Design a protein around this motif. Structure first.
Motif, PDB file in Angstrom:
ATOM      1  N   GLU A 161       0.823  -1.230   0.000  1.00 17.97           N
ATOM      2  CA  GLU A 161       0.000   0.000   0.000  1.00 17.97           C
ATOM      3  C   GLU A 161       0.862   1.288   0.000  1.00 17.97           C
ATOM      4  O   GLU A 161       0.417   2.335  -0.468  1.00 17.97           O
ATOM      5  CB  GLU A 161      -0.920   0.060   1.230  1.00 17.97           C
ATOM      6  CG  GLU A 161      -2.031  -1.004   1.273  1.00 17.97           C
ATOM      7  CD  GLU A 161      -2.793  -1.048   2.613  1.00 17.97           C
ATOM      8  OE1 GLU A 161      -2.634  -0.151   3.482  1.00 17.97           O
ATOM      9  OE2 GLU A 161      -3.562  -2.004   2.791  1.00 17.97           O
ATOM     10  N   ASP A 194      -1.684   1.827  16.960  1.00 17.82           N
ATOM     11  CA  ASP A 194      -2.700   2.873  16.753  1.00 17.82           C
ATOM     12  C   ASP A 194      -2.868   3.314  15.291  1.00 17.82           C
ATOM     13  O   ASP A 194      -3.973   3.645  14.882  1.00 17.82           O
ATOM     14  CB  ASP A 194      -2.402   4.120  17.607  1.00 17.82           C
ATOM     15  CG  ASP A 194      -2.615   3.892  19.101  1.00 17.82           C
ATOM     16  OD1 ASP A 194      -3.290   2.922  19.501  1.00 17.82           O
ATOM     17  OD2 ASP A 194      -2.117   4.722  19.879  1.00 17.82           O
ATOM     18  N   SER A 195      -1.787   3.287  14.513  1.00 20.03           N
ATOM     19  CA  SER A 195      -1.823   3.739  13.113  1.00 20.03           C
ATOM     20  C   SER A 195      -2.417   2.756  12.110  1.00 20.03           C
ATOM     21  O   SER A 195      -2.673   3.146  10.973  1.00 20.03           O
ATOM     22  CB  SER A 195      -0.406   4.121  12.654  1.00 20.03           C
ATOM     23  OG  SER A 195       0.385   2.974  12.450  1.00 20.03           O
ATOM     24  N   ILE A 196      -2.656   1.499  12.502  1.00 20.30           N
ATOM     25  CA  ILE A 196      -3.119   0.476  11.562  1.00 20.30           C
ATOM     26  C   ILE A 196      -4.621   0.621  11.298  1.00 20.30           C
ATOM     27  O   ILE A 196      -5.418   0.496  12.220  1.00 20.30           O
ATOM     28  CB  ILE A 196      -2.755  -0.962  12.056  1.00 20.30           C
ATOM     29  CG1 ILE A 196      -1.232  -1.132  12.206  1.00 20.30           C
ATOM     30  CG2 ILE A 196      -3.260  -2.011  11.063  1.00 20.30           C
ATOM     31  CD1 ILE A 196      -0.791  -2.462  12.933  1.00 20.30           C
ATOM     32  N   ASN A 197      -4.991   0.845  10.033  1.00 23.19           N
ATOM     33  CA  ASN A 197      -6.392   1.050   9.616  1.00 23.19           C
ATOM     34  C   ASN A 197      -7.224  -0.214   9.417  1.00 23.19           C
ATOM     35  O   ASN A 197      -8.450  -0.157   9.519  1.00 23.19           O
ATOM     36  CB  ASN A 197      -6.494   1.913   8.342  1.00 23.19           C
ATOM     37  CG  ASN A 197      -6.414   3.387   8.623  1.00 23.19           C
ATOM     38  OD1 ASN A 197      -5.354   3.919   8.944  1.00 23.19           O
ATOM     39  ND2 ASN A 197      -7.535   4.073   8.454  1.00 23.19           N
ATOM     40  N   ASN A 198      -6.569  -1.322   9.091  1.00 17.04           N
ATOM     41  CA  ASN A 198      -7.215  -2.608   8.935  1.00 17.04           C
ATOM     42  C   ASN A 198      -7.393  -3.210  10.351  1.00 17.04           C
ATOM     43  O   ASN A 198      -6.387  -3.553  10.987  1.00 17.04           O
ATOM     44  CB  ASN A 198      -6.342  -3.492   8.043  1.00 17.04           C
ATOM     45  CG  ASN A 198      -7.000  -4.775   7.678  1.00 17.04           C
ATOM     46  OD1 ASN A 198      -7.379  -5.565   8.546  1.00 17.04           O
ATOM     47  ND2 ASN A 198      -7.131  -5.018   6.374  1.00 17.04           N
ATOM     48  N   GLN A 202      -4.463  -4.960  12.681  1.00 13.32           N
ATOM     49  CA  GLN A 202      -4.170  -4.250  13.937  1.00 13.32           C
ATOM     50  C   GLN A 202      -4.233  -5.244  15.105  1.00 13.32           C
ATOM     51  O   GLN A 202      -3.337  -5.284  15.930  1.00 13.32           O
ATOM     52  CB  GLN A 202      -5.176  -3.116  14.149  1.00 13.32           C
ATOM     53  CG  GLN A 202      -4.926  -2.267  15.366  1.00 13.32           C
ATOM     54  CD  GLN A 202      -5.979  -1.195  15.579  1.00 13.32           C
ATOM     55  OE1 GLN A 202      -7.177  -1.473  15.513  1.00 13.32           O
ATOM     56  NE2 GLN A 202      -5.541   0.025  15.876  1.00 13.32           N
TER      57      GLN A 202
ATOM     58  N   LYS B 133       2.054   9.300   6.028  1.00  6.77           N
ATOM     59  CA  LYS B 133       2.093   7.831   5.886  1.00  6.77           C
ATOM     60  C   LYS B 133       3.242   7.143   6.653  1.00  6.77           C
ATOM     61  O   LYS B 133       3.249   5.918   6.749  1.00  6.77           O
ATOM     62  CB  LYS B 133       2.171   7.443   4.398  1.00  6.77           C
ATOM     63  CG  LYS B 133       0.941   7.822   3.570  1.00  6.77           C
ATOM     64  CD  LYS B 133      -0.250   6.915   3.868  1.00  6.77           C
ATOM     65  CE  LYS B 133      -1.492   7.330   3.099  1.00  6.77           C
ATOM     66  NZ  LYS B 133      -2.616   6.413   3.410  1.00  6.77           N
ATOM     67  N   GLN B 136       2.364   4.713   9.830  1.00  8.78           N
ATOM     68  CA  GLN B 136       1.770   3.429   9.379  1.00  8.78           C
ATOM     69  C   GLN B 136       2.756   2.593   8.579  1.00  8.78           C
ATOM     70  O   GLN B 136       2.708   1.350   8.621  1.00  8.78           O
ATOM     71  CB  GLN B 136       0.452   3.605   8.615  1.00  8.78           C
ATOM     72  CG  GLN B 136      -0.404   2.303   8.640  1.00  8.78           C
ATOM     73  CD  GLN B 136      -1.697   2.380   7.844  1.00  8.78           C
ATOM     74  OE1 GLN B 136      -1.928   3.299   7.069  1.00  8.78           O
ATOM     75  NE2 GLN B 136      -2.525   1.385   8.012  1.00  8.78           N
TER      76      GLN B 136
END
Lengths: 228, 228
Positions: A161, A194-198, A202, B133, B136
């Motif tokens: 990504e 904390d930064s992981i969107n999935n 996470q 970014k 992450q």
């Protein structure tokens, strides 16, 4: 010396991926796929190539003759599942390939043990000695190793990504698996988590951090991981 | 070869970049520093540590006109170095992410050219990553890094049965390279119940959950969630 080509009656259920019918046919044995228990009568070797061995043994019991050979391919079943077939006059065995041409095998007697060793040898394999009592956990260990594929693919999609270069991403991920690195500081682990969107990733990031923390005795990270 | 530099480096064990070793390997004159005031003789000052803001505060007072400053933190953006730019410094950042790829930044064309030259002599190429970014991306690299935790833990577990590190390694590598579908729920439960190391057992469940999320095997996912 060479053993004879046997008339083999195989019960394939769809539960096993051992492909024993194929394996035995490829070395010259005469393999028939059986569908009814009574069809075993005329066969020298009866193969139970399925996970539900106990169920097949119960059905086959009434038709088992003296001198008939019986083999199961389940990794988790010990040889005692075949007991009804020995008492009924049979030569009982088991053989399961675990990878790299390594197999786990069992028998109740010297004749069975010699025959299963020869059949395994003909399939290009070598027997690894394992107590039947530890088979259930051997299955667990193979599956546990198999999750490396889940994590590698998941980590590759995640890292790609940012890079948008699948080949570079895969090489970085490969290197990451083979090169050890210590956990960063707790605050860094928390900031990264904390930064992981999935949500799925996470959650697994936290669980993996707990495992590394357990292994490395990084108590602050472990205590953080478990207070979820 | 461009001019060598007198490099002063702050390293408190928080970073694994080993910027001192890297810069020393290409012929720069590298000295690890212990006090903020010791930057006086130096042309390039490297903050090879995670607590960048703390170093920037301490160094602000001693920074002189034309001195170069570089931090190696992947998570910090270039603005953390503003106090040094205000003192007449040339600020930059460079962090290696694997496979000789580097994330770099600067505030001006001179700093951009210099950091690109430094990354290039270290055999690197720069990948562009937006400041928003970075946190992450750090998480993604650590996540891929957990493959080491799992691979080592899975190899130890499987080698309890095999007693042959080379064979165990080959089975483990095949397991990582080849995807196999998750077993039936009853098998997953049976395998889980058999793991006697409590930390491994916990992670087995969590990996089963992650794979179940990805493959949409909801029965295994619900099971895994119910086991905390």
């Amino acid at each position: 010396m060479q053993a004879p080509r046997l008339r083999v009656g195989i019960f394939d259920d769809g539960s096993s991926t051992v492909n024993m019918a194929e394996k035995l046919d490829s070395v010259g044995h005469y393999v028939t796929v059986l569908h009814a228990p009574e069809d075993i009568r005329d066969f020298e070797l009866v193969v139970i190539d399925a996970h539900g061995v106990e169920g097949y043994v119960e059905k086959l019991s009434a038709f088992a003759r003296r001198g008939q050979m019986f083999l199961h391919t389940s990794l988790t079943h010990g040889i005692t599942v075949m007991d009804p077939l020995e008492t009924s006059g049979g030569i009982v065995m088991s053989a399961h390939p675990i990878g790299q041409d390594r197999w786990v095998a069992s028998a109740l007697d010297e004749l069975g043990e010699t025959i299963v060793g020869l059949l395994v040898g003909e399939l290009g394999g070598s027997i690894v000695e394992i107590a039947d009592d530890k088979r259930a956990q051997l299955a667990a260990a193979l599956t546990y190793a198999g999750f490396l594929s889940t994590l590698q693919r998941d980590a590759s999609y995640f890292l790609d990504e940012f890079l948008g270069d699948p080949d570079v991403t895969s090489d970085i991920v490969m290197d990451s698996a083979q090169q050890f690195q210590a956990l960063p500081s707790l605050d860094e682990v928390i900031a990264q988590y904390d930064s992981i969107n999935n949500p799925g990733r996470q959650r697994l990031f936290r669980d993996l951090a707990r495992r590394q923390a357990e292994i490395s005795r990084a108590q602050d990270i472990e205590l953080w991981a478990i207070q979820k």
